């Protein structure tokens, strides 16, 4: 395997620790954190951007059970 | 007690025509928690909360001797349930299953004789 220029895909994609390093922060993706430098493994954090409107939502299991 | 399926539309009233939106929702008929009110209540099942509007599991109450049953208020759409209130922020319903729409609609919603014996009987009955 090797590494190349990252390209955009849909939501809910499998991302390895080498795969997340190429994630770029662009206002099109609505990434505005406090750390501003990310792409390690695990779960990231997205700070509130515009309080007037939400970012987006996807149907998950936690929404129904919690 | 009796399961029923319906939906909601917007609040804008101009020509009395409200175009339904594919919003997932369910309403159930239960009198009360302690049954101390004396009349059946119309609630909203917490199914989905689409973004872009204000939707919450809010209940609804009916006042006997006031609300009258109109079979349809709309000349374009069909199966529009009309419950007239006074400044109560009316919530319009609609019948999910489609039994009609290919014929002119005057008194037709579900059945002329069957529906007329439901909402009128519940209106006069109060506990």
PDB file of C-alpha atoms in Angstrom:
ATOM      1  CA  UNK A   1       0.000   0.000   0.000  1.00  0.00           C
ATOM      2  CA  UNK A   2       0.935   3.672  -0.337  1.00  0.00           C
ATOM      3  CA  UNK A   3      -0.435   7.169   0.285  1.00  0.00           C
ATOM      4  CA  UNK A   4      -1.718   9.771  -2.164  1.00  0.00           C
ATOM      5  CA  UNK A   5      -3.775  12.957  -2.330  1.00  0.00           C
ATOM      6  CA  UNK A   6      -7.006  12.698  -0.298  1.00  0.00           C
ATOM      7  CA  UNK A   7     -10.385  12.992  -1.998  1.00  0.00           C
ATOM      8  CA  UNK A   8     -13.846  13.569  -0.562  1.00  0.00           C
ATOM      9  CA  UNK A   9     -16.371  10.782   0.045  1.00  0.00           C
ATOM     10  CA  UNK A  10     -19.728  10.392   1.794  1.00  0.00           C
ATOM     11  CA  UNK A  11     -20.469  10.199   5.521  1.00  0.00           C
ATOM     12  CA  UNK A  12     -19.708   7.205   7.767  1.00  0.00           C
ATOM     13  CA  UNK A  13     -16.496   5.893   6.237  1.00  0.00           C
ATOM     14  CA  UNK A  14     -13.915   3.557   7.750  1.00  0.00           C
ATOM     15  CA  UNK A  15     -10.804   5.587   8.592  1.00  0.00           C
ATOM     16  CA  UNK A  16      -7.486   4.116   9.727  1.00  0.00           C
ATOM     17  CA  UNK A  17      -4.939   6.146  11.735  1.00  0.00           C
ATOM     18  CA  UNK A  18      -2.911   6.601   8.543  1.00  0.00           C
ATOM     19  CA  UNK A  19      -6.143   7.507   6.722  1.00  0.00           C
ATOM     20  CA  UNK A  20      -7.150  10.335   9.079  1.00  0.00           C
ATOM     21  CA  UNK A  21      -3.854  12.234   8.743  1.00  0.00           C
ATOM     22  CA  UNK A  22      -4.905  13.506   5.299  1.00  0.00           C
ATOM     23  CA  UNK A  23      -8.250  14.897   6.498  1.00  0.00           C
ATOM     24  CA  UNK A  24      -8.218  18.621   5.716  1.00  0.00           C
ATOM     25  CA  UNK A  25     -10.102  21.376   7.537  1.00  0.00           C
ATOM     26  CA  UNK A  26     -12.228  23.388   5.093  1.00  0.00           C
ATOM     27  CA  UNK A  27     -15.299  25.527   5.766  1.00  0.00           C
ATOM     28  CA  UNK A  28     -17.076  23.451   3.106  1.00  0.00           C
ATOM     29  CA  UNK A  29     -16.827  20.486   5.494  1.00  0.00           C
ATOM     30  CA  UNK A  30     -17.685  22.829   8.412  1.00  0.00           C
ATOM     31  CA  UNK A  31     -14.604  21.965  10.485  1.00  0.00           C
ATOM     32  CA  UNK A  32     -13.851  24.708  13.025  1.00  0.00           C
ATOM     33  CA  UNK A  33     -12.338  23.164  16.187  1.00  0.00           C
ATOM     34  CA  UNK A  34     -10.290  24.750  18.963  1.00  0.00           C
ATOM     35  CA  UNK A  35      -7.301  22.475  18.329  1.00  0.00           C
ATOM     36  CA  UNK A  36      -7.291  23.283  14.578  1.00  0.00           C
ATOM     37  CA  UNK A  37      -4.794  20.437  14.001  1.00  0.00           C
ATOM     38  CA  UNK A  38      -6.189  16.893  14.006  1.00  0.00           C
ATOM     39  CA  UNK A  39      -6.195  13.697  11.962  1.00  0.00           C
ATOM     40  CA  UNK A  40      -5.070  11.198  14.586  1.00  0.00           C
ATOM     41  CA  UNK A  41      -7.164   8.114  15.317  1.00  0.00           C
ATOM     42  CA  UNK A  42     -10.179   8.024  17.616  1.00  0.00           C
ATOM     43  CA  UNK A  43     -13.031  10.513  17.821  1.00  0.00           C
ATOM     44  CA  UNK A  44     -12.511  14.174  16.911  1.00  0.00           C
ATOM     45  CA  UNK A  45     -14.388  17.249  18.170  1.00  0.00           C
ATOM     46  CA  UNK A  46     -16.298  19.894  16.197  1.00  0.00           C
ATOM     47  CA  UNK A  47     -16.879  23.195  17.984  1.00  0.00           C
ATOM     48  CA  UNK A  48     -20.149  25.064  17.480  1.00  0.00           C
ATOM     49  CA  UNK A  49     -19.877  27.152  14.314  1.00  0.00           C
ATOM     50  CA  UNK A  50     -23.126  29.094  13.815  1.00  0.00           C
ATOM     51  CA  UNK A  51     -25.665  28.973  16.682  1.00  0.00           C
ATOM     52  CA  UNK A  52     -28.437  30.235  14.382  1.00  0.00           C
ATOM     53  CA  UNK A  53     -28.654  26.940  12.462  1.00  0.00           C
ATOM     54  CA  UNK A  54     -27.490  23.371  13.124  1.00  0.00           C
ATOM     55  CA  UNK A  55     -24.768  21.734  11.059  1.00  0.00           C
ATOM     56  CA  UNK A  56     -26.492  18.483  10.049  1.00  0.00           C
ATOM     57  CA  UNK A  57     -27.874  15.245  11.475  1.00  0.00           C
ATOM     58  CA  UNK A  58     -27.825  11.550  10.562  1.00  0.00           C
ATOM     59  CA  UNK A  59     -29.991   8.778  11.988  1.00  0.00           C
ATOM     60  CA  UNK A  60     -28.103   6.783  14.634  1.00  0.00           C
ATOM     61  CA  UNK A  61     -28.910   4.268  17.363  1.00  0.00           C
ATOM     62  CA  UNK A  62     -28.143   6.575  20.302  1.00  0.00           C
ATOM     63  CA  UNK A  63     -30.821   9.079  19.257  1.00  0.00           C
ATOM     64  CA  UNK A  64     -33.606   6.520  19.717  1.00  0.00           C
ATOM     65  CA  UNK A  65     -32.281   4.687  22.792  1.00  0.00           C
ATOM     66  CA  UNK A  66     -30.948   7.761  24.636  1.00  0.00           C
TER      67      UNK A  66
ATOM     68  CA  UNK B   1     -57.087   1.462  22.781  1.00  0.00           C
ATOM     69  CA  UNK B   2     -57.583   2.195  19.072  1.00  0.00           C
ATOM     70  CA  UNK B   3     -54.503   2.580  16.883  1.00  0.00           C
ATOM     71  CA  UNK B   4     -54.594   5.300  14.235  1.00  0.00           C
ATOM     72  CA  UNK B   5     -52.142   6.675  11.669  1.00  0.00           C
ATOM     73  CA  UNK B   6     -51.999  10.290  10.493  1.00  0.00           C
ATOM     74  CA  UNK B   7     -49.688  13.241   9.857  1.00  0.00           C
ATOM     75  CA  UNK B   8     -49.478  17.016  10.155  1.00  0.00           C
ATOM     76  CA  UNK B   9     -49.168  19.949   7.756  1.00  0.00           C
ATOM     77  CA  UNK B  10     -48.142  23.590   8.078  1.00  0.00           C
ATOM     78  CA  UNK B  11     -50.032  26.352   9.902  1.00  0.00           C
ATOM     79  CA  UNK B  12     -50.371  28.790   6.981  1.00  0.00           C
ATOM     80  CA  UNK B  13     -54.041  29.481   6.193  1.00  0.00           C
ATOM     81  CA  UNK B  14     -54.846  31.508   3.071  1.00  0.00           C
ATOM     82  CA  UNK B  15     -56.957  29.484   0.630  1.00  0.00           C
ATOM     83  CA  UNK B  16     -57.360  26.691   3.228  1.00  0.00           C
ATOM     84  CA  UNK B  17     -54.922  24.570   1.198  1.00  0.00           C
ATOM     85  CA  UNK B  18     -51.969  23.027   3.059  1.00  0.00           C
ATOM     86  CA  UNK B  19     -49.717  20.710   1.056  1.00  0.00           C
ATOM     87  CA  UNK B  20     -48.701  17.719   3.223  1.00  0.00           C
ATOM     88  CA  UNK B  21     -45.030  16.872   3.695  1.00  0.00           C
ATOM     89  CA  UNK B  22     -43.588  13.334   4.051  1.00  0.00           C
ATOM     90  CA  UNK B  23     -42.966  13.681   7.799  1.00  0.00           C
ATOM     91  CA  UNK B  24     -42.987  10.472   9.837  1.00  0.00           C
ATOM     92  CA  UNK B  25     -45.378  10.745  12.771  1.00  0.00           C
ATOM     93  CA  UNK B  26     -48.009   8.828  14.693  1.00  0.00           C
ATOM     94  CA  UNK B  27     -50.929   9.907  16.880  1.00  0.00           C
ATOM     95  CA  UNK B  28     -52.622   7.780  19.537  1.00  0.00           C
ATOM     96  CA  UNK B  29     -55.955   8.168  21.322  1.00  0.00           C
ATOM     97  CA  UNK B  30     -55.805   7.870  25.124  1.00  0.00           C
ATOM     98  CA  UNK B  31     -58.072   9.624  27.655  1.00  0.00           C
ATOM     99  CA  UNK B  32     -55.377  10.709  30.141  1.00  0.00           C
ATOM    100  CA  UNK B  33     -52.715   9.258  32.419  1.00  0.00           C
ATOM    101  CA  UNK B  34     -55.038   9.140  35.448  1.00  0.00           C
ATOM    102  CA  UNK B  35     -58.213   9.379  33.297  1.00  0.00           C
ATOM    103  CA  UNK B  36     -59.329  12.397  35.350  1.00  0.00           C
ATOM    104  CA  UNK B  37     -59.911  14.735  32.387  1.00  0.00           C
ATOM    105  CA  UNK B  38     -63.015  13.015  31.017  1.00  0.00           C
ATOM    106  CA  UNK B  39     -62.224  13.069  27.289  1.00  0.00           C
ATOM    107  CA  UNK B  40     -59.868  11.323  24.888  1.00  0.00           C
ATOM    108  CA  UNK B  41     -56.550  13.056  24.192  1.00  0.00           C
ATOM    109  CA  UNK B  42     -54.645  13.225  20.900  1.00  0.00           C
ATOM    110  CA  UNK B  43     -50.890  12.889  21.432  1.00  0.00           C
ATOM    111  CA  UNK B  44     -47.923  12.616  19.056  1.00  0.00           C
ATOM    112  CA  UNK B  45     -45.630   9.596  19.025  1.00  0.00           C
ATOM    113  CA  UNK B  46     -41.899  10.455  19.150  1.00  0.00           C
ATOM    114  CA  UNK B  47     -40.931   9.018  15.749  1.00  0.00           C
ATOM    115  CA  UNK B  48     -38.895  11.612  13.833  1.00  0.00           C
ATOM    116  CA  UNK B  49     -38.091  15.312  14.300  1.00  0.00           C
ATOM    117  CA  UNK B  50     -37.206  16.756  10.873  1.00  0.00           C
ATOM    118  CA  UNK B  51     -34.904  19.773  10.945  1.00  0.00           C
ATOM    119  CA  UNK B  52     -36.094  23.113   9.573  1.00  0.00           C
ATOM    120  CA  UNK B  53     -39.248  23.512  11.678  1.00  0.00           C
ATOM    121  CA  UNK B  54     -40.500  23.254  15.264  1.00  0.00           C
ATOM    122  CA  UNK B  55     -41.736  19.759  16.141  1.00  0.00           C
ATOM    123  CA  UNK B  56     -41.947  18.314  19.651  1.00  0.00           C
ATOM    124  CA  UNK B  57     -44.039  15.613  21.353  1.00  0.00           C
ATOM    125  CA  UNK B  58     -46.742  18.090  22.406  1.00  0.00           C
ATOM    126  CA  UNK B  59     -50.212  16.912  23.405  1.00  0.00           C
ATOM    127  CA  UNK B  60     -53.589  18.243  22.268  1.00  0.00           C
ATOM    128  CA  UNK B  61     -56.927  18.729  24.029  1.00  0.00           C
ATOM    129  CA  UNK B  62     -60.476  18.955  22.692  1.00  0.00           C
ATOM    130  CA  UNK B  63     -63.384  21.006  24.042  1.00  0.00           C
ATOM    131  CA  UNK B  64     -66.812  19.327  23.691  1.00  0.00           C
ATOM    132  CA  UNK B  65     -69.753  21.420  22.560  1.00  0.00           C
ATOM    133  CA  UNK B  66     -67.545  23.704  20.452  1.00  0.00           C
ATOM    134  CA  UNK B  67     -65.531  21.955  17.741  1.00  0.00           C
ATOM    135  CA  UNK B  68     -67.640  21.018  14.713  1.00  0.00           C
ATOM    136  CA  UNK B  69     -66.779  18.394  12.103  1.00  0.00           C
ATOM    137  CA  UNK B  70     -66.268  19.625   8.531  1.00  0.00           C
ATOM    138  CA  UNK B  71     -65.769  16.739   6.060  1.00  0.00           C
ATOM    139  CA  UNK B  72     -63.262  18.647   3.912  1.00  0.00           C
ATOM    140  CA  UNK B  73     -62.224  22.305   3.829  1.00  0.00           C
ATOM    141  CA  UNK B  74     -60.024  21.953   0.720  1.00  0.00           C
ATOM    142  CA  UNK B  75     -61.097  21.938  -2.928  1.00  0.00           C
ATOM    143  CA  UNK B  76     -57.655  20.751  -4.124  1.00  0.00           C
ATOM    144  CA  UNK B  77     -56.262  18.229  -1.631  1.00  0.00           C
ATOM    145  CA  UNK B  78     -58.269  15.491   0.056  1.00  0.00           C
ATOM    146  CA  UNK B  79     -58.817  13.683   3.349  1.00  0.00           C
ATOM    147  CA  UNK B  80     -58.086  16.870   5.305  1.00  0.00           C
ATOM    148  CA  UNK B  81     -59.317  16.498   8.887  1.00  0.00           C
ATOM    149  CA  UNK B  82     -60.742  19.837  10.056  1.00  0.00           C
ATOM    150  CA  UNK B  83     -61.204  20.445  13.792  1.00  0.00           C
ATOM    151  CA  UNK B  84     -62.225  24.048  14.447  1.00  0.00           C
ATOM    152  CA  UNK B  85     -60.800  25.660  17.593  1.00  0.00           C
ATOM    153  CA  UNK B  86     -60.677  29.216  18.953  1.00  0.00           C
ATOM    154  CA  UNK B  87     -57.139  30.675  18.979  1.00  0.00           C
ATOM    155  CA  UNK B  88     -55.849  27.232  20.016  1.00  0.00           C
ATOM    156  CA  UNK B  89     -53.262  26.911  17.193  1.00  0.00           C
ATOM    157  CA  UNK B  90     -55.109  24.256  15.218  1.00  0.00           C
ATOM    158  CA  UNK B  91     -53.268  21.088  14.172  1.00  0.00           C
ATOM    159  CA  UNK B  92     -54.554  19.589  10.926  1.00  0.00           C
ATOM    160  CA  UNK B  93     -54.420  15.844  10.281  1.00  0.00           C
ATOM    161  CA  UNK B  94     -54.507  13.640   7.193  1.00  0.00           C
ATOM    162  CA  UNK B  95     -55.380  10.006   6.507  1.00  0.00           C
ATOM    163  CA  UNK B  96     -52.350   7.952   5.486  1.00  0.00           C
ATOM    164  CA  UNK B  97     -54.078   5.253   3.431  1.00  0.00           C
ATOM    165  CA  UNK B  98     -55.405   6.492   0.084  1.00  0.00           C
ATOM    166  CA  UNK B  99     -58.899   5.202  -0.728  1.00  0.00           C
ATOM    167  CA  UNK B 100     -59.847   8.101  -3.021  1.00  0.00           C
ATOM    168  CA  UNK B 101     -58.591  11.078  -5.022  1.00  0.00           C
ATOM    169  CA  UNK B 102     -59.721   9.904  -8.472  1.00  0.00           C
ATOM    170  CA  UNK B 103     -63.278  11.200  -7.908  1.00  0.00           C
ATOM    171  CA  UNK B 104     -64.763  14.568  -6.908  1.00  0.00           C
ATOM    172  CA  UNK B 105     -64.723  15.160  -3.151  1.00  0.00           C
ATOM    173  CA  UNK B 106     -67.636  16.863  -1.403  1.00  0.00           C
ATOM    174  CA  UNK B 107     -68.389  15.053   1.863  1.00  0.00           C
ATOM    175  CA  UNK B 108     -65.959  12.223   1.054  1.00  0.00           C
ATOM    176  CA  UNK B 109     -63.038  11.722   3.439  1.00  0.00           C
ATOM    177  CA  UNK B 110     -63.118   8.075   4.522  1.00  0.00           C
ATOM    178  CA  UNK B 111     -66.808   7.092   4.568  1.00  0.00           C
ATOM    179  CA  UNK B 112     -69.785   9.448   4.630  1.00  0.00           C
ATOM    180  CA  UNK B 113     -71.951   7.456   7.046  1.00  0.00           C
ATOM    181  CA  UNK B 114     -69.163   5.889   9.125  1.00  0.00           C
ATOM    182  CA  UNK B 115     -67.152   9.024   9.931  1.00  0.00           C
ATOM    183  CA  UNK B 116     -70.308  11.058  10.604  1.00  0.00           C
ATOM    184  CA  UNK B 117     -71.175   8.677  13.462  1.00  0.00           C
ATOM    185  CA  UNK B 118     -67.722   8.936  15.082  1.00  0.00           C
ATOM    186  CA  UNK B 119     -66.700  12.547  15.709  1.00  0.00           C
ATOM    187  CA  UNK B 120     -70.289  13.650  16.371  1.00  0.00           C
ATOM    188  CA  UNK B 121     -70.856  10.968  19.004  1.00  0.00           C
ATOM    189  CA  UNK B 122     -67.584  11.737  20.782  1.00  0.00           C
ATOM    190  CA  UNK B 123     -68.398  15.464  20.715  1.00  0.00           C
ATOM    191  CA  UNK B 124     -71.579  15.064  22.773  1.00  0.00           C
ATOM    192  CA  UNK B 125     -70.088  12.408  25.071  1.00  0.00           C
ATOM    193  CA  UNK B 126     -68.143  13.911  27.973  1.00  0.00           C
ATOM    194  CA  UNK B 127     -67.024  12.553  31.339  1.00  0.00           C
TER     195      UNK B 127
END
